[PDB]
Each structure stands twice: as C-alpha cells, then as structure tokens.
Swiss-Prot record:
Component of a calcium channel complex consisting of a pore-forming alpha subunit (CACNA1C) and ancillary beta, gamma and delta subunits. The channel complex contains alpha, beta, gamma and delta subunits in a 1:1:1:1 ratio, i.e. it contains only one of each type of subunit. CACNA1C channel activity is modulated by ancillary subunits, such as CACNB1, CACNB2, CACNB3, CACNA2D1 and CACNA2D4. Interacts with the gamma subunits CACNG4, CACNG6, CACNG7 and CACNG8. Interacts with CACNB1. Interacts with CACNB2. Identified in a complex with CACNA2D4 and CACNB3. Interacts with CACNB3. The record marks 224, 798, 1079 as: Calcium ion selectivity and permeability. A motif (Selectivity filter of repeat II) lies at residues 507-510. This is Voltage-dependent L-type calcium channel subunit alpha-1C. Inhibited by dihydropyridines (DHP), such as isradipine. Inhibited by nifedipine. Channel activity is regulated by Ca(2+) and calmodulin. Binding of STAC1, STAC2 or STAC3 to a region that overlaps with the calmodulin binding site inhibits channel inactivation by Ca(2+) and calmodulin. Binding of calmodulin or CABP1 at the same regulatory sites results in opposite effects on the channel function. Shear stress and pressure increases calcium channel activity. It is found in: Cell membrane; Cell membrane, Sarcolemma; Perikaryon; Postsynaptic density membrane. GO terms for biological process: calcium ion import across plasma membrane; calcium ion transmembrane transport; calcium ion transmembrane transport via high voltage-gated calcium channel; calcium ion transport into cytosol; camera-type eye development; cardiac conduction; cardiac muscle cell action potential involved in contraction; cell communication by electrical coupling involved in cardiac conduction. Elevated levels of blood glucose lead to increased phosphorylation by PKA. The gene is CACNA1C. Each of the four internal repeats contains five hydrophobic transmembrane segments (S1, S2, S3, S5, S6) and one positively charged transmembrane segment (S4). S4 segments probably represent the voltage-sensor and are characterized by a series of positively charged amino acids at every third position. Changing residue 630 to I: Affects voltage-dependent inhibition by dihydropyridines. Residues 772-861, 1093-1157 are annotated as: Dihydropyridine binding.
C-alpha cells in the first residue's frame, strides 16, 4: 500500500478535511440536550469521517510503522474520535471530548506544503519573544502579590438600603462602599454600607487570592477594563493611592512591554530582509519594473507609427493621442471625479427632494461621460495598452460595475451599495503633480508582487479564527442563556455569531465581558468552573501575536522594498540626467545665566496655570494665581523690552510676544468680563510652548517631529481617502435605519409616543412607567460627516460591537430594529477593521520605522569599518583589567569563599522563591492559625536574610559591600522588613512591600533578560526630550480640558463622575491617560457635548449651559496626536538600540569581549596591566573558540600565532590588556599580512574618537 498512499489519495483526504470542516460549522449547539434533524444527520456523517480517517491511519501505520508531529497529531485525533464514538454508543462527560474535533482544520496546514513554511515562519519568530513573556510573567506576579497585600477583601460591601439585606439596592451596577470610619465612597441618603457582598463582577474581579489577583492584573495589563478596577478600588479604600498602583502597572507592563515587543519584532524582520537582500530577491522586483516600463515605452512607440499612412484617421486619431496627454484631458477627468465625489457625498437622511433628483441625474450623466472617457482612451491608444497599467484595469472594472449595478437599483432587484464611490480612487492621481507618487506606486507594486504571501498569511489568520470559533462554539454553545432580562449579543450560539465573538476578542474590545460570561456559564468563581478562562487568555495573547506578526510583517517587509525601489528610480534618474546631459552640456539677550532663569520663570508660570480652580468662579486660590500672573508677565515683558534694544525677529519671538500681548489685552479690557475672557484664557496654554526656543534639544526634538510629519503625508492622506470611501458606502447602508424606540414593540416615530410599562429586573410584579422616546444611535450614518466619526471609533476598537449589533438589526429607513435581520452586514465592519484598523495602521507604524531607519542610518561612517570591527576596535582602545578584592587575612577569606561560591547563590535564590510562595497564599477568609503561621514563617525569612546581609557585609567590607548597587537595594529590603516585624507584633503597609522586591533580583538574571532590559532602559535614558513631548501634550490638553469642560456636573450615571472629571489637574491628566489607553474615550467625548448641567459651585442660565461642541475636535485630535507621539518615542527608543536588536549572536561582539575581562579578573587582582607568562597555555582555551580557539593544546598553529602576533611594545610579561585584546580581536576577525601595522596605526587616528596619545605604548 506504499503505492496507494501516493497520488491523489492525499487530495481525497484533504477534501474530506474540508467536508468535516463544513459539517462542523453547520452543527447548532442547543441548550440542555436539545437538537434537530440536521444535528442528528451530522452525527451520522461523523461516523463516515471517522471511518475514513481510521483507514488512513491503518494504511499509513502498516506502511511506515509517528516521528513527525503532524502524523502524530492525526493519530491522536483518530484515537480520541474512536474513544468518543465508542463511549457515546455505550452511554447512549459523554459529549465533552468532542472538542478534539476542532483540531482537524489544523490538518489543512499540514496537507499543503505551501502553508507549513508560513506557519514555521510565524512560529519561529516567537522564540525571541520568550524573553519578554518571562518579564510580563514576573511583572504580573509581583503586581498580583502587591494587590494581594493592598486590596485583599476590601471589595465585599455595598449599600444595602435600610430595611435589612434585601438585594444590593443600587441599579444593576452596585459599587463598593466604605464604613463611616472609612475613606472610601460613602452610601447615599437612604442607604447603609453593610458587608456580605459577592463582588464587583459576581466575585470574579477582586484581589482575594493569587488566582483572582493574578487575573485582574493581567486584565489590567491588556488595557481593557482597568479603569473599572481602579474606580472600584477607589470606592473601596479611597482616592489617594490606587493610581500609583494602576498607572505604574499600565506604564510598566502595557506600554514598556509593547515597546519591547515592537523592538524585538522589527529587529528580527530587519535581520531577515538583510539575509534576503544578501541572497537576492529585490533584483527580481527591480528588473521586473523596468521591464514593463519599456513595455509601456517602446510598445507605445510602435503604436504611434500605426497611423502613419503613406482610412482617414490621421485627421482625428493624431489629435486624440495629443488630447489625452495634453494636460487638458487629465484635468477635465479630475474635475469630473471631484463632481462625482461631491454628488455622492451629499446624500444625507431626509434630504430635499430636489437633491435626490439632481444627484441621480448626475450619477447617470457622469457615468455616461466616464464611459465615453473609457471608449476614447481604449481605441485611440490600443486595446491591449489599456490593460498594461493598473489604474486602467481598475477604471475598467469600476465603470463596468457601475453600468451593471445601476440597473439592479433602477428596477428594484437590488438595494444600493455605493458602487461608484470608487472613482475617488482616482483622485489619487493628483499626486502625479507631487513627488509623492513614485513612492506610493512602488508600495502598491510590492503589495501586488507579494500577493501570494499576503493571501497565505491571511489564510492562516482565518484558520486560527475558524479553529477558535469552533472550540468556543463547543465550549460555550447554548450556555450563555441566563435568566437575566438581557439577552447577550456576543455569544457562541451560531457559526457566524461565534466568528463575530472571536473577532471581537481578537480586536480586544470587551473581551473581559465575554470571559466573565464564559466563567459564569460554567458555574461561577470556583476552582473547577473558573478554569475556563485559559481559553480567553490564550486566544487573546495568541491572536494579538498573530495579528501583529501577519500585518507588521507585511507592512515593514513591503515598505522596505518600496523605499528601495524609490531609491533605485531616484539614482537612475540622476545618472541619466547627469551622463545624458554630459555629452551635450560639454544687551543681555545673549547671556547664559539669564536665559536659564527666564526658562525657570517660564516653567513656573505654567504651574500657576495648572493650579487654578475650574469650577469656583471666585475662590482664594484663584486670586493669588490671578495676582501672581502680574509679576510673571512683567518679567516676560522686561525680557521682551530688553530684546528690542538688541535687534529689530524670528518665528519664535512671534509666539513670545503673542503670549505677552494676549495677557496684556486680557488685563486691557477688564470691563467686558463675560465675553472674550473664556475665549482668551484658552490661548494661555501656549505659555509652556515658549521653552521650545530656549531649551535646545527640545528645539531639536520638535524639528524632528515636524520633519517626520511631512513624510507620512502619503499614509495620512490615503487612509483619509479610504475612510471617506468607507463612510460614503456606510451612508448608503445605514442612513435613517439606526433608530430605536424605548418600547421595543413600536417601530415608527408616529407609533412611539406616550408612556409604556417597564419591569425592573424582569420581575412581572414590579411595573414601572417610563416615557416612550424615539432615539438614534450614539454614532449614526445619516451624513457623510457622521459616518467618518462613527468609523473612527470603530477603527479605535472602542464601542464597535455596539455599533455592529445595532447595524445588524437595522432593516428599513424610518423603522425600528429587528433581531438579527442582516447578520451578513457584519462583513462591512470586518472589512473596514481589516483594511483600516489592521492594515493601514500597521503600514503607518512600519513607515515610521523605515523612515527613521533611513533618516538616522544613511550617514553611518562611509570609511570601511564593518559593523562589528568598529566596536571591537573601540573597546580595544578603551579597556582595562578588573578588580577582585581578594580578602587578605584569611580569617575573612573563608567567609568570602563561602559567600562567593556558586552554591550560596542557589541557596539564596531558593530562599527568595520560597518567600514569594509564602507571600502568594495569603487568601481572604484565612483562619487565625494561618495568619499566625504566616507571621512566624516570615520571621525566619527575615532572619536568614539579615544574617546573609551581615555575612556578606563582613566578607566584602562595608566599602566593597555597599559599592555594588545590588546590596544597597537588598539593604533597604532587609531593613524595611526588620522594622516591619517589630511594628507587626504590636500601622503602615509600605514596609510589607519590600519583601516582594526580592523577586526583582531573580528577575534580573540570565544573559537575555538582563541585557535586553538594560539596553532598553539605557536607550530610554539617552532620549529624555522625546518623552518630554508627551508630557507637554498632556499638560496642554489637560489645561484646555480644565478651562472648557471643567465645570460639568458630576453625575455618577454619566462618564463625568467623581472618578472621571476635569475639576483638577491630576484628574484631567488621569482622564487624558484613560483616553490615551483607549477606555471608552468616545463616551467621555459624548458626555462633554453641549447641553449638560453645570455645577453647584460654578454658579438661572442653568437651563444647560455646559458642554461644548469643541469636544469632538478635542478628543479626536488628542487621540491622534497621543498615538503619533507614543509611536514616535517608541521607534526612537527602538532604533537607539538597533545594534542590539540585530546583534547576530553567532559572531564576535561585546558579549564575549566583556567575558574576557572577567576571565582575566582572577589572574590579575588589580587593574595594573602586568601579565603572567604562564597564561599562554590556558588563556584562550579557558572560554571558547568564538573568542579564541577550541581548547586545543598549546602546541598548535593557534598557539603559535598567539605569540607570533607581536605584543605591542612591552617587555616580558608586561603587555597591557588593551594590546593583547586588540591582537586577539584582530586575529579573530579581519586578519592581515605583515607590513600593514602602520596602515592600522594611521587608520586608528583618522575616523575613531580621539586616542589622547594613550596608544603611544601600543604602536608596534
Ligand atoms: C521600584 C522598585 C525597584 C525597582 C528596581 C530596583 C533597582 C535597584 C537596583 C538596581 C541594580 C542596577 C544594576 C543592574 O544590575 O542593571 C542591570 C539589571 O537591572 C535590572 O534589570 C532591574 C530591573 C527593574 C525592573 C522593575 C520592575 C518591577 C516593578 C516594580 C513594582 C512597583 C509597584 C509599586 C506599586 C505601589 C502601590 C502603592 C544589569 O546591569 P549589568 O551588569 O548587566 O550592566 C553592566 C554594565 O552596565 C554594561 O554597561 C552593560 O553593557 P550593555 O548591556 O551593553 O549596556 C553590561 O550588561 P550585560 O552584561 O547585560 O551586557 C554589564 O557589564
Ligand atoms: C504614556 C505616558 C503617560 C504619561 C502621563 C502619566 C499620567 C499619570 C496620571 C497622574 C495623575 C493620576 C490621578 C491622580 O493624581 O489621582 C487623582 C487624585 C485626586 O483625588 P482627590 O480629590 O484627592 O480625592 C478625593 C477623595 N479623597 O489624586 C490625588 O489625590 C492627588 C495626587 C497628585 C499627583 C500629582 C502628579 C500628577 C500629575 C503629573 C503630571
Ligand atoms: C470632496 C469631499 C472631500 C468634500 C465634500 C463636502 C460636501 C459634499 C459634504 C461634506 C459635509 C456635508 C454636510 C454635512 C452635514 C450636513 C447637515 C445636514 O443638513 C445634512 C446635509 C449636510 C449639509 C451635508 C451636505 C454635504 C456636505 C456639505
Ligand atoms: C487549548 C485551550 C485554548 C483550551 C483549554 C481547555 C481545557 C484545558 C480546560 C478549559 C475549560 C475547562 C473546563 C472548565 C469547567 C469545567 C466544568 C467542571 O465540570 C470541571 C471541569 C471542566 C469541564 C473544565 C475542564 C478543563 C477545561 C476543558
Ligand atoms: C515638568 C512639569 C511641566 C510637569 C507638571 C508639573 C505641574 C504642572 C503639576 C504636577 C503636580 C501638580 C499639582 C498636583 C496637586 C495639586 C493639588 C490640587 O488641589 C491643586 C493643583 C495641584 C497643586 C497641582 C498643580 C500643578 C502640578 C504642580
Ligand atoms: C506561587 C505559587 C505557590 C502559586 C500559589 C497557588 C496556591 C498556593 C494558592 C492560589 C489559589 C489559592 C486558593 C484560592 C481560594 C481559596 C478559597 C479560600 O476560602 C480558602 C483558600 C483557598 C483554597 C486558596 C488557598 C491558596 C491557593 C491554593
Ligand atoms: C445626571 O445629572 C444630574 C445628577 O442628578 C441629574 O440631572 C440626572 O440624574 C442626570 N442628568 C440627566 C439629564 O438625566
Ligand atoms: Ca475598550
């Protein structure tokens, strides 16, 4: 049968896999053992599938005798299927191991060798990320322990009315309160704080054990629902110090970690494109584009002689060619496209009846005129030269589609879908007048050249979603049916619904809600029931990795080729225009101590602006700051006065005078103080912007951002055009259709008047009368300016499922919703998310990365210096031996040898590991015996750690002990726990947090974690001004928010509450941080719209005077600018460390060169520079051949060359470490024949940093 398992028997079993994948998507999970006919026949078909796979297993197991992973997986699936079928026939948890059927789609990857390569390229890019997964795990553990020690059991009480404990009488969302002696949220008028409450999320979200806390910390790290936890803690303990926990956790484990991931992935993509260039693949793309260039060239020249007639087309056809390329037929078509866009983007809801006539006549006249355009271009330029180009085929398709789809809406067969909106994609022809069109054409060329790889990465992305959708359907199918009056929309009941839910989890929005529903579907918070959260954890952290390795590996690997093609076409043009044109052509202003004081006053005038009181119109604090501004602006005027004697202007003194003039005319009017003041006090936020031209480096990192902004002017305009097109298509689908009545039984505005009966919590015995209101969606598709705002919030992955499930229910204009009407309309949102929120955003990030690479890398050195020998010679010049501190008076040497042994390290590491375990099982509700045991167990750990501190201080001496930073870090921990024990046997918690920091010592171990973290921290420190831009942005926007939305009333049912408001600078900064992390920022935006209530203190005109419409611009601009600046800082830090991110550890470098120092250390205690001649035999053989040679005996050619290379100018064993290191590194790489020593001598004084005449002894 070794013959029968070849030929298309492997295609038969592939079609069988495809059939079993369709028989899995048709199955409908029914609650409580229900079924239908289809699910009854599918089980019968499973027998055929299983019998087919079992004979495949037989024929491959008696013909091969398993070693491969895929065949073993197939055997496992077959065995589990047999066992499940037999068990089900026996009983007739039975159907609980059917979840192994979802691993059968994984056989499609193995069935074709063209996708195994892609899967391996995706999976092997992950092993460099295991040095970031460990860091994330350590951060999670440390923060879980800190939350255990800070917020354990504090979220188990809430307002309970005053009749007893009836049922959590505060809406459907009860929040934790605190007792009258507490510092948390106090209960309302007719309520009392009383314990005995499940928890904020049915007891799932809390810090009770190391299982709840370790999952709450992870959920916060994924930046989803972290403000909810922060506000629950705020209501529990207080509003003073949970932000120090949560904001630090977000910064350390969500932004820093993502920066590390981006750096490691970009340095790995570059370290493969460099290999591809070395082998050669750009040449194929380059030598193909010039081919069709001449095939667009000479092949038009052949057709230009087609009508040289020596039957009378020369009169007209010669003019048709001229007119087409006359810059008249190029501007006329642009004007027509602009007109078409104008009449397409003018379709609103309830438009005037004449507009719907003008636009439909235009949609026919312009369509006919464009058809005439096509016909004129085709026959007058060759019918096969109209297919050579890419826009020409696109225009052909769009014209033909417009003509075809016009009829289907003309006579009612089909409902409009905006087919002509794609002529706009011809406005991108206006880029021809700009230089930014050869750059945008090569990107499309690379995208269309790597189509076979894009369509395979997308296929793997879809297979992942399908497999996890089937698994979620198996687990949670027919289980999200709870008795609560709300029917969950994101469920796992169908195949399309499962696909939508898995896609929503992959996008990240509200994944924690689906996880909570899944946890409560399998019971509640309990050991066996809560174990179904690994599904949502693994799905999130293994789908967000695939979404970032599929789309970034397409953006960066294609933009790098696009820029290479652009460079090639830019040098070819220059060479042609240079050689082809070569045969024919041939006073205290300038102080230093005064500018730094003016800068201090500038920075002081911005604190008096952030300390104001937005609400209280008249207050004491508002009086001195209004009084201190008099002296503040006078000095800025005296500085401005003193600068007109010096000279008589630049583009920064304009702003410097603008602020002073604004302040003066603010104090100038002083009489119209109800007007202008609230539109002139907003321009006071330009006060911090006066340090841009006074704090050089801040001037450089503002020039760099403005140079970088003009470079992304292609990615920002193409994305805007795509968003406009998608909005125009969405207005034709959801205009006038997203309206709803409060009474779900009424589907007309003339039918939604009056009051209706509502039942609280679905209790029929408790009716409540509510008014009937006809309302629209929060974000609608009525205009072309509302669709672009509804789509922006979708692209930011905020509240997009709500819009999805509101648009699915829409069926008819001027009508209400219908449950699951057009579930097939979700493809619109899926395509928009894939194209805009996944493809174009990653293109923008990759463009920033590549642009920074070229901007900061093209200089290099231009003088040989290969990219390892550079640092090799640099450290050869700058080096010295280490210090050892051997303890003379051997009474100390015994203890020192004991301490510096390799067993003390393991003993201490095990001690820390046991301490972190003893701190990891302090639960809530522990018995008193457990608490006393915990105390008299921490006692021993503190004792052994203080004796180890003493026994290390004795050996290393107080001079050599505290010198190393690690001992002083442990010194506080031991002291922080010694005093903690004393005050624990008898009120503070900050001393307990010291013990957890001991795990940081274990974290900072290994040569990968330590090196990566240290290099990234150093790169962060090397650019302190790039991070100042974000601080300035946050400060400016916080001040603006304080002056605009600072007076809005604090209702707890809105998004402007006690926790979230603009009433203080810290609160405004926290709100802006929340919006930067993307946490219902659109809800805060809509809670700041005009027509809300002002606030007690901020003074009637109180109909509703608060809210500005400035909110839309404020929030959208802040989101865009914050994202841009965060990406800017991220890429700057990443490419400040690109020599480590592309290290190629298999070749010489700092790693072995630094170890040479330590292997020297013992032989030479002091630095000095004197050597032992006994070294030769063992010197290089001590470590490895990567530095020296492979431990060979001191009689080989390697040993002969060890002495043959003359030690530079040193008698006997007095060679300096620099000389021997340089000789070693020049033997290891870049070897040269004798007589070139003077060449190296002259090279080491030309382009390297100054030697300071310190190589005078190292010359020969
Ligand atoms: C705050 C509490 C404590 C924070 C940290 C305390 C630090 C005090 C001790 C500092 C020791 C610093 C010396 C040190 O060891 O620096 C790092 C390790 O440090 C970490 O990873 C340290 C990583 C720290 C991670 C912090 C995350 C923990 C979260 C805290 C939770 C706080 C939450 C608070 C909640 C409050 C609620 C109210 C390693 O130092 P190194 O020995 O590798 O570096 C040397 C040297 O610097 C060379 O320049 C370096 O070359 P490059 O690598 O090319 O730069 C050589 O490095 P390699 O040998 O690796 O090539 C080495 O030859
Ligand atoms: C990505 C890069 C991000 C960079 C920006 C990070 C932003 C971190 C956010 C910092 C502020 C956090 C919010 C905050 O301070 O908490 C609010 C709270 C005020 O609440 P309060 O009215 O005091 O409480 C009433 C009931 N006791 O606070 C207080 O109690 C006052 C604490 C004052 C803190 C001053 C420093 C904050 C501003 C830094 C700029
Ligand atoms: C060429 C592209 C980029 C810009 C097109 C701008 C025009 C066609 C669009 C943009 C903003 C639109 C307006 C946005 C809002 C309103 C208010 C309401 O009464 C519906 C129509 C009306 C008045 C729209 C008419 C069409 C409109 C003016
Ligand atoms: C591979 C990843 C994505 C999924 C892992 C699934 C496995 C390891 C987990 C996740 C869900 C878990 C189930 C969750 C809840 C229950 C209900 C109860 O009767 C105990 C066992 C049982 C049935 C668990 C068994 C183990 C389980 C099936
Ligand atoms: C480098 C600079 C720009 C960073 C920002 C520092 C300034 C603007 C911030 C940092 C901390 C802030 C203070 C934090 C807390 C309070 C208490 C509050 O009841 C009034 C405002 C006041 C007094 C803030 C004034 C502005 C402040 C001093
Ligand atoms: C860091 C390593 C040791 C992981 C720690 C896991 C162990 C030690 C922790 C995590 C989950 C914990 C359990 C979670 C919930 C409860 C219910 C509570 O009413 C009694 C304690 C008990 C039963 C906890 C005991 C300790 C526990 C088993
Ligand atoms: C929220 O604000 C106040 C606070 O009570 C009140 O008007 C009402 O509860 C809410 N506002 C509206 C308009 O419903
Ligand atoms: Ca969200």
């Amino acid at each position: 049968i070794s013959i029968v398992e070849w030929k298309p028997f492997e295609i038969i079993i592939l079609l069988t896999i495809f059939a079993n994948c369709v028989a899995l998507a048709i199955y409908i999970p029914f609650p409580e053992d229900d079924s239908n006919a289809t699910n009854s026949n599918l089980e019968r078909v499973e027998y055929l599938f299983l019998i087919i796979f079992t004979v495949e297993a037989f024929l491959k197991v008696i013909a091969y005798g398993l070693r491969n992973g895929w065949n073993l997986l197939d055997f496992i699936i077959v065995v589990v299927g047999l066992f499940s079928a037999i068990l089900e026939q026996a009983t007739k948890d039975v159907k609980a191991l059917r979840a192994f059927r979802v691993l059968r789609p994984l056989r499609l990857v193995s069935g074709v060798p063209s996708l195994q390569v892609v899967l391996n390229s995706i999976i092997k890019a992950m092993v460099p990320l295991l040095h970031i997964a460990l860091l994330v795990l350590f951060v999670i553990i440390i923060y879980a322990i800190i939350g255990l020690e800070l917020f354990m059991g504090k979220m188990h009480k809430t307002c309970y009315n005053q009749e007893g404990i009836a049922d959590v009488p505060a809406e459907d969302d009860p929040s934790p309160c605190a007792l009258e002696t507490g510092h948390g949220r106090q209960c309302q008028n007719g309520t009392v704080c009383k314990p005995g409450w499940d928890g904020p999320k049915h007891g799932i979200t809390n810090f009770d054990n190391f299982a709840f806390a370790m999952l709450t910390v992870f959920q916060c790290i994924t930046m989803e629902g972290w403000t909810d936890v922060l506000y629950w803690v705020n209501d529990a303990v207080g509003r003073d110090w949970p932000w120090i926990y949560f904001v630090t956790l977000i910064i350390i484990g969500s932004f820093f970690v993502l920066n590390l991931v981006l750096g490691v992935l970009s340095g790995e993509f570059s370290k493969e494109r460099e290999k591809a260039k070395a082998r050669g693949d750009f040449q194929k793309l380059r030598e193909k584009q010039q081919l069709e260039e001449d095939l667009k060239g000479y092949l038009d020249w052949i057709t230009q002689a087609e009508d040289i007639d020596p039957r009378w087309n020369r009169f007209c056809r010669r003019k048709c060619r001229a007119a087409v390329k006359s810059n008249v037929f190029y501007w006329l078509v642009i004007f027509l496209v602009f007109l078409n866009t104008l009449t397409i983007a003018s379709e609103h809801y309830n438009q005037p009846n004449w507009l719907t006539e003008v636009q439909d006549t235009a949609n026919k006249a312009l369509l006919a005129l464009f058809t005439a355009e096509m016909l004129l271009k085709m026959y007058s330029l060759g019918l096969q030269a109209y297919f050579v180009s890419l826009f020409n085929r696109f225009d052909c398709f769009v014209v033909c589609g417009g003509i075809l789809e016009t009829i289907l809406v003309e006579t009612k067969i089909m409902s409009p879908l905006g087919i002509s909106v794609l002529r706009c994609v011809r406005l991108l022809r206006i880029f021809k007048i700009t230089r930014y069109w050869n750059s945008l054409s090569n990107l499309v060329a690379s995208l269309l050249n790597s189509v076979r790889s894009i369509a395979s990465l997308l296929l793997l992305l879809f297979l992942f979603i399908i497999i996890f959708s089937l698994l979620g359907m198996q687990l949670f199918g027919g289980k999200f049916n709870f008795d609560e009056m709300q029917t969950r929309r994101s469920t796992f009941d169908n195949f399309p619904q499962s696909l939508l839910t898995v896609f929503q989890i992959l996008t990240g929005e509200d994944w924690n809600s689906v996880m909570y529903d899944g946890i409560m579907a399998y019971g509640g918070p309990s050991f066996p029931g809560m174990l179904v959260c690994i599904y949502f954890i693994i799905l999130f952290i293994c789908g967000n990795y695939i979404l970032l390795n599929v789309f970034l590996a397409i953006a960066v690997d294609n933009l790098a080729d696009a820029e290479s093609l652009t460079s090639a076409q830019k040098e070819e043009e220059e060479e042609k225009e240079r050689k082809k044109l070569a045969r024919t052509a041939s006073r205290i202003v300038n102080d230093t101590i005064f500018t730094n004081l003016i800068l201090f006053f500038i920075l002081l005038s911005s604190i008096s602006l952030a300390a104001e009181d937005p609400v209280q119109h008249t207050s004491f604090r508002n009086h001195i700051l209004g009084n201190a501004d008099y002296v503040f602006t006078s000095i800025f005027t005296l500085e401005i006065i003193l600068k007109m004697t010096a000279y008589g202007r630049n583009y920064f003194n304009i702003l410097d005078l603008l602020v002073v003039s604004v302040s003066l005319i603010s104090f100038g009017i002083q009489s119209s103080a109800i007007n202008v003041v609230k539109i002139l006090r907003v321009l006071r936020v330009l006060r911090p912007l006066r340090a841009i031209n006074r704090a050089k480096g801040l001037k450089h990192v503002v020039q760099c951002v403005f140079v970088a902004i003009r470079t992304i002017g292609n990615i920002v305009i193409v994305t805007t055009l795509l968003q406009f097109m998608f909005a125009c298509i969405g207005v034709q689908l959801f205009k006038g259709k997203l309206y709803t009545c409060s009474d779900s039984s009424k589907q007309t505005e003339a039918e939604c008047k009056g009051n209706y009966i509502t039942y609280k919590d679905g209790e029929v015995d408790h009716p409540i009368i509510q008014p009937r209101s006809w309302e629209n969606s929060k974000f609608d598709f009525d205009n072309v300016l509302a669709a672009m705002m509804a789509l922006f919030t979708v692209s930011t992955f905020e509240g997009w499922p709500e819009l999805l499930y509101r648009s699915i229910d829409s069926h008819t204009e001027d009508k209400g919703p219908i449950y699951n009407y057009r579930v097939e309309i979700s493809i619109f949102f899926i395509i928009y998310i894939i194209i805009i929120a996944f493809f174009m955003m990653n293109i923008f990030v990759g463009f920033v990365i590549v642009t920074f690479q070229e901007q900061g890398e093209q200089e290099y050195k231009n003088c040989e210096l290969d990219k390892n020998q550079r640092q090799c010679v640099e450290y050869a010049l700058k080096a010295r031996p280490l210090r050892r501190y051997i303890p003379k008076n051997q009474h100390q040497y015994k203890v020192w040898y004991v301490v510096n042994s390799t067993y003390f390290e393991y003993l201490m590491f095990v001690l820390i590991l046991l301490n972190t375990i003893c701190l990891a099982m302090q639960h809530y509700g522990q018995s008193c015996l457990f608490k006393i045991a915990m105390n008299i167990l921490n006692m021993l750990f503190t004792g052994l750690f203080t004796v180890e501190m003493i026994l290390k201080l004795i050996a290393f001496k107080p001079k050599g002990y505290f010198s190393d930073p690690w001992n002083v870090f442990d010194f506080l921990i031991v002291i922080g726990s010694i005093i903690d024990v004393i005050l624990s046997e008898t009120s503070i918690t900050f001393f307990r947090l010291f013990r957890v920091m001991r795990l940081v010592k274990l974290l900072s171990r290994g040569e990968g974690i330590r090196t990566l973290l240290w290099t990234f921290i150093k790169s962060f420190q090397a650019l302190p001004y790039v991070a100042l831009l974000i601080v300035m942005l946050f400060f400016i926007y916080a001040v603006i928010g304080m002056q605009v939305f600072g007076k809005i009333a604090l209702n707890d049912t809105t998004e402007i509450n006690r926790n979230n408001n603009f009433q203080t600078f810290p609160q405004a900064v926290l709100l802006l941080f929340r919006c930067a992390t993307g946490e219902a920022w659109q809800d805060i935006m809509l809670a700041c719209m005009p027509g809300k209530k002002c606030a007690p203190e901020s003074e009637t005109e109180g109909e509703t005077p608060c809210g500005s419409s400035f909110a839309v611009f404020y929030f959208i601009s802040f989101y865009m600018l914050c994202a841009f600046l965060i990406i800017n800082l991220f890429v700057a830090v990443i490419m400040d460390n690109f020599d480590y991110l592309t290290r190629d550890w298999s070749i010489l470098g700092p790693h072995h060169l630094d170890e040479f120092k330590r292997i020297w250390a013992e032989y030479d205690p002091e630095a000095k520079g004197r050597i032992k001649h006994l070294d030769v035999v063992t010197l290089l053989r001590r470590i490895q051949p990567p530095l020296g040679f492979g431990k060979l005996c001191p009689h080989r050619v390697a040993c002969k060359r060890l002495v043959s290379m003359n030690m530079p100018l040193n008698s006997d064993g007095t060679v300096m470490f620099n000389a021997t290191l340089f000789a070693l590194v020049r033997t290891a790489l870049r070897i040269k024949t004798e007589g070139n020593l003077e060449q190296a001598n002259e090279e080491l004084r030309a382009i390297i940093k100054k030697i300071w005449k310190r190589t005078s002894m190292k010359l020969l």
